[PDB]
Ligand binder design. Sequence first.
Ligand SMILES: O=C(Nc1c[nH]nc1C(=O)NC1CCNCC1)c1cc(F)cc(F)c1
Length: 280
Amino acid sequence: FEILGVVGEGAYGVVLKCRHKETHEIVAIKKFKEVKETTLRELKMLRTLKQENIVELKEAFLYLVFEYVEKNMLELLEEMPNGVPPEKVKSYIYQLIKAIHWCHKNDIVHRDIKPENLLISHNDVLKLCDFGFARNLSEGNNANYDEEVATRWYRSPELLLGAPYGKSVDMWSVGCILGELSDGQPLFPGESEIDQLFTIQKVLGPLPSEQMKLFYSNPRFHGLRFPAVNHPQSLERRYLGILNSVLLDLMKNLLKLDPADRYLTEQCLNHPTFQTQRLL
Ligand SMILES: O=C(Nc1c[nH]nc1C(=O)NC1CCNCC1)c1cc(F)cc(F)c1
């Protein structure tokens, strides 16, 4: 394997764009910078989680070599800064939901669903990557989070204010990505986590009472004002003329402030917006 470059580094290890010397195959090799989150789990999590919308473990040799995908969704949104075409919004989110469905069935919450970890193939096939930050639903009791700020923006209001993290928070990330794909803009951006609660409430309205109670019981937010909103702007108003109305209905169910009301994957896939997509 010759080394062709560095794909990325961050807080998860290092991914190297490498090429097999015999076969001119660009591959993405991950090694760490076992190491905090076990490559050993990942190589088995990626032994079960083999499906067309999850990254392929091509081989392993201390560590892991993946298929190389030239692009991710983060790059797409920079090149299409006002959103990708509406048909692509439905296609990518449907593929993303399918990958989450295959993760959630084996009781794996991905925990770092963001546009960087969504690769898009030359055939426009979405593939989920970076399972290092995950937790399986048994065992677990983990921290091992991605604490990057871009990751924060895809987190549930419950997780920001201190709750456990389950399948419902993975679905909240899907709704955040649906909106960003539609107009290119981060739905819930915040330099500070508290500023995010303003942006969550400015669209989805005042928070549930359980959540606003945990706010006043948490060390991280003490001493500071609550991001209160007089007159909220609904999702319907936020994406008026931008999103197909049937697709907007899926998003509303993805972004229920109370985690209990949130759609999980089977309801999302059987949602109306995918009827013709459910054939294709
Ligand atoms: O497996 C990962 N990434 C990849 C596998 N195959 N291709 C890629 C890849 O990132 N491709 C990019 C897309 C954008 N354009 C440059 C090439 C991976 C693992 C992590 F832990 C963290 C992470 F961010 C990515």
